[PDB]
Design a protein around this nucleic acid. Structure first.
Length: 189
RNA sequence: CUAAGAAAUUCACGGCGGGCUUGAUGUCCGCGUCUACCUGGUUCACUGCCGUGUAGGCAG
């Protein structure tokens, strides 16, 4: 509903990295060279998203502000690797604005982190917390929640997103220092 | 609508004593294996400090 300043990002297909790898590289570059000095308005929804085939990211769409894009796209934390993807263009916000509140948050993924929490500041049974981790115990994003991770943990990327309901309503909220929404986002369409 | 039809069939047990297989021996001669390569395999569709109810900001 409030996707006035709109932009897109298309990572071109090449044999030097996967589409999820290119999306993770673009997301890490945006999180390092967009919320480096801070900021308020950052909206990064799936501009070419399809959450039915289990693919969380294969296209980028930015719904940000005017001054947030006039000074948030001219740094070396964004440029440099522009030989795979391309630049963007500005577009106005139409009357059709679905309230797709896109966020940048986490989800429950610890199958033994409850035991660490009980040992640190809980005083709970750590053996039952370790043995209480079945396949039907973890409840994370089973839809395409693309987790662009780093080279610190061997475990693969689970869900890290705050998606909203796509309808004909309006829902906007406060953007964080990483390109998300803390109660809503800009439009998507 | 089976070449239809049907059947308790058995209880017991000491294998054992003994022995010289031995003598002798030349396996030899020769050889071209070679050409090319993306493992990002995700090395569990995952490991972690807020309340051990899906309830958090990191070079994950």
């Amino acid at each position: 509903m409030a996707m006035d300043h709109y932009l897109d990002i298309r990572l071109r297909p090449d044999p030097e990295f996967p589409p999820a790898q290119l999306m993770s590289v673009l997301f890490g570059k945006l999180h390092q060279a967009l919320v480096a000095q801070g900021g308020d308005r950052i909206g990064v929804s799936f501009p070419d998203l399809d959450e039915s085939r289990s693919r969380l990211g294969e296209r980028l769409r930015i719904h940000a502000s005017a001054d947030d894009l006039r000074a948030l796209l001219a740094r070396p934390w964004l440029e440099g690797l522009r030989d795979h993807l391309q630049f963007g263009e500005p577009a106005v916000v139409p009357h059709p604005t679905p309230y797709r509140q896109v966020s940048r948050v986490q989800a429950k993924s610890n199958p033994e982190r409850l035991r660490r929490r009980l040992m640190r500041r809980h005083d709970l049974s750590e053996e039952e917390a370790r043995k209480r981790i079945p396949d039907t115990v973890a409840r994370a994003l089973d839809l395409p929640f693309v987790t662009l991770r780093s080279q610190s943990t061997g475990q693969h990327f689970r869900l890290f997103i705050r998606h909203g309901p796509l309808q004909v309503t309006a829902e906007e909220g406060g953007f964080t220092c990483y390109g998300l929404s803390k109660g809503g986002f800009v439009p998507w369409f």
